[PDB]
Amino acid sequence: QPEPRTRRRAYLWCKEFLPGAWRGLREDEFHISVIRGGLSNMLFQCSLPDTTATLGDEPRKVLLRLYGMVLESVMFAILAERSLGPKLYGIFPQGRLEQFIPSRRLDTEELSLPDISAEIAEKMATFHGMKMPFNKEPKWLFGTMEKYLKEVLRIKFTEESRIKKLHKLLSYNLPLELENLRSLLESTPSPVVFCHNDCQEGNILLLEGRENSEKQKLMLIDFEYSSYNYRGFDIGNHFCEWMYDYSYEKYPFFRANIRKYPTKKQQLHFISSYLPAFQNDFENLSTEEKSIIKEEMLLEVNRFALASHFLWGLWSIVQAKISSIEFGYMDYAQARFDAYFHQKRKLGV
Amino acid sequence: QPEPRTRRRAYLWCKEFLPGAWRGLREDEFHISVIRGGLSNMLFQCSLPDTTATLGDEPRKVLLRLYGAEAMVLESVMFAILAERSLGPKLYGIFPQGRLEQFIPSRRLDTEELSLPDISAEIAEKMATFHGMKMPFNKEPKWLFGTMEKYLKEVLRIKFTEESRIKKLHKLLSYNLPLELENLRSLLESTPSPVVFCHNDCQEGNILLLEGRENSEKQKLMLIDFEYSSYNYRGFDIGNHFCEWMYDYSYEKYPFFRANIRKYPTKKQQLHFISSYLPAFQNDFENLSTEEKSIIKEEMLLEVNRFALASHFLWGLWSIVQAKISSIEFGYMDYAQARFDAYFHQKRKLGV
Ligand SMILES: CN1CCCN(Cc2ccc3ncccc3c2)CC1
Ligand SMILES: CN1CCCN(Cc2ccc3ncccc3c2)CC1
């Protein structure tokens, strides 16, 4: 349960924005509980009295999201219209009402289950074929990294620990290294598509009641960082996410495990599912040509995986200065940068 | 024939938002033409050279829309949804200064085409369809009297200089609009009308006659320009449309419209409209008792004609507000008086 200053707001929003029973519902009939609290993007679960029959096809239970601009909204509406996302039941200046999808999030170690990562591949490829009314020019990747790098070189921390950690990070010569990375990635062909850009296990729902479905038990959510971007980044980033488990209950509240990065075999298995789903003609290609393509895609995504480390490393340093959320951001930054340089050595680039 | 800045900015938007031949298009080979000028919602046609080949789906031609001089999230979300549902033009690009839309070969309707039976029948079907839609917006019917209240307040505190505008304003105030509003409200709050997703501005200039289709009998029109849309009393949407039968905005001299009260649809014409509307809006209707059909229709007419009074009042108030702030060449005050003339005349018609 929430505070008084809300739940009423939540009451009004549900009563005004939802059809059916919601329309005549009394403030004492309103059921609401917290799904995730905090200062920003708070989730809530609102529901009709179980003793209330629905008048039409309106939802019994809904997700309320409180922001705590225009593109984010257009995108969610579109994904909703195409059944790629939760339905959009209502939208307003300080949040929105979304479909409540009975489910849990994936856990890190589940990303490696052959059936799971085969469906994530298939879903990412599908996400990747969608037309969106947004800029098709791949500005996002280096634009965001420059934006973050510049912030980082302006960040001053008070406590000695953060100063120390920032100092060790700045000692990699991030500006120079960004240019080394630009060189590498420019010379690495990767089709521009609509990328989720944050395809981590916490954004993948296992839909309850089909945990037994072999190719249809997952849904991708949270598209807040989505944009047109190099394909290799969405895949590389997701592969990186195999190494990071955010459920750790002690500070810094994540574990990094480099050994958990997908093996070549595991990589070939993800992309062997991705490709058929991304170009429908791929399956009919010559056994030999498929491997030509797969070997190339492996080079492609493992290289862009470096951008995942670099971008989210920088991102993490900024979050440290400004976020309230309890999470060891600097240590995570240090982890992403270690994995960065470990991956460079591994690739010999 | 746009200005250097725009067309340069339009070239860029097109090249960066549109797929296919567009993305490799050079500036020297970019075609743009004006469809509407002004300061607010300029319209442009953009296209590929005729010698250039499309690579895939991409359109050969598109409409650029510049917003000119944050409810934009609502408009944009709406515009995008109607597109996904094939009810509006496709949405190719959205950005701070405007949007890229599908170009749809067509012309708009003339006022006197609104009364043509097939036209009127299809408009009624399209509107009913439009009304059945779920939209992620607030379902409380506050738009109508909220907006009028908003305009009335603005109206009460505007002072003109220019003599003729000053006189015209006072004659409108003569009527005691705050009292008159209150009692429009009482009249209407006693007039049941289903709350639905309304277009709210269904005038001829917002209805496309689709090219290639002037032969189809029930499928040659598309409603567009949903800028004023919202959940609202169905009666408003229909009443407002009926009012627009009376108003012709193609008139070339000041005040740049003709009002003709006597072009308002006859009862026979109104019945012909909702005879298409009702089977298009609800399922069983077609096969209800020919006795209950008539009960439904007759009440609806009282409903839509009563709400037509809100059309006159709302747009009259809006028009007065436009006279202060708008620069567009249009006799807003004269148009304000005409709506209010129709308001009191319609009131007289109804004995309310
Ligand atoms: C921007 N997204 C991709 C970058 C990695 N990820 C790190 C992360 C994951 C889970 C967290 N859970 C709680 C707090 C911080 C967290 C940070 C942040 C999410
Ligand atoms: C809000 N809409 C319905 C109210 C009447 N209408 C007045 C109008 C119609 C056409 C015009 N065409 C050009 C200039 C002004 C115009 C004003 C405005 C549009």
XYZ file of C-alpha atoms in Angstrom, chain A residues 15-19 23 57-58 69-71 73-74 77-78 81-82 88-93 131-139, chain B residues 12 15-19 23 57 70 72-74 76-77 80-81 84-85 91-95 134-142:
64
model
C -11.960 5.744 -13.016
C -11.619 8.316 -15.773
C -9.402 6.418 -18.259
C -10.806 2.871 -18.124
C -14.193 1.629 -19.468
C -16.504 3.935 -14.671
C -13.959 -6.445 -22.292
C -12.263 -3.894 -20.038
C 8.924 13.040 -24.388
C 6.655 12.596 -27.404
C 8.739 9.819 -28.951
C 4.772 7.744 -26.013
C 4.310 7.305 -29.773
C 1.343 3.242 -28.499
C 2.649 1.740 -31.715
C -1.144 -1.482 -31.542
C 1.041 -4.157 -33.159
C -1.913 1.214 -23.695
C -5.059 1.889 -21.686
C -4.412 5.485 -20.795
C -1.845 8.241 -21.066
C -1.403 11.513 -19.182
C 1.250 14.116 -18.274
C 9.196 0.461 -39.151
C 9.084 3.322 -36.674
C 8.458 7.034 -37.381
C 11.897 7.910 -36.076
C 15.258 9.006 -37.435
C 16.782 6.076 -39.384
C 20.238 7.611 -39.258
C 22.478 5.727 -36.776
C 23.354 8.755 -34.597
C 17.002 16.583 -44.287
C 16.336 11.862 -46.166
C 16.757 10.851 -42.541
C 13.263 9.583 -41.725
C 12.237 7.946 -45.005
C 13.525 4.545 -46.183
C 18.172 7.975 -47.866
C 7.931 0.130 -49.827
C 2.686 19.663 -24.301
C 1.474 17.380 -28.626
C 2.061 13.995 -27.003
C -1.688 13.411 -27.091
C 0.979 12.548 -31.825
C -0.090 9.405 -29.978
C -0.031 7.340 -34.673
C -2.814 5.095 -33.438
C -1.768 1.833 -37.282
C -5.502 1.225 -37.507
C 2.962 8.243 -40.005
C 6.463 8.256 -41.503
C 8.237 10.670 -39.240
C 7.684 12.649 -36.107
C 9.932 15.439 -34.845
C -10.919 2.918 -27.896
C -8.320 5.610 -27.259
C -5.856 5.904 -24.345
C -7.493 9.183 -23.336
C -9.645 10.498 -20.493
C -13.176 9.186 -20.936
C -14.889 11.942 -18.941
C -17.002 14.324 -21.114
C -15.343 17.457 -19.718
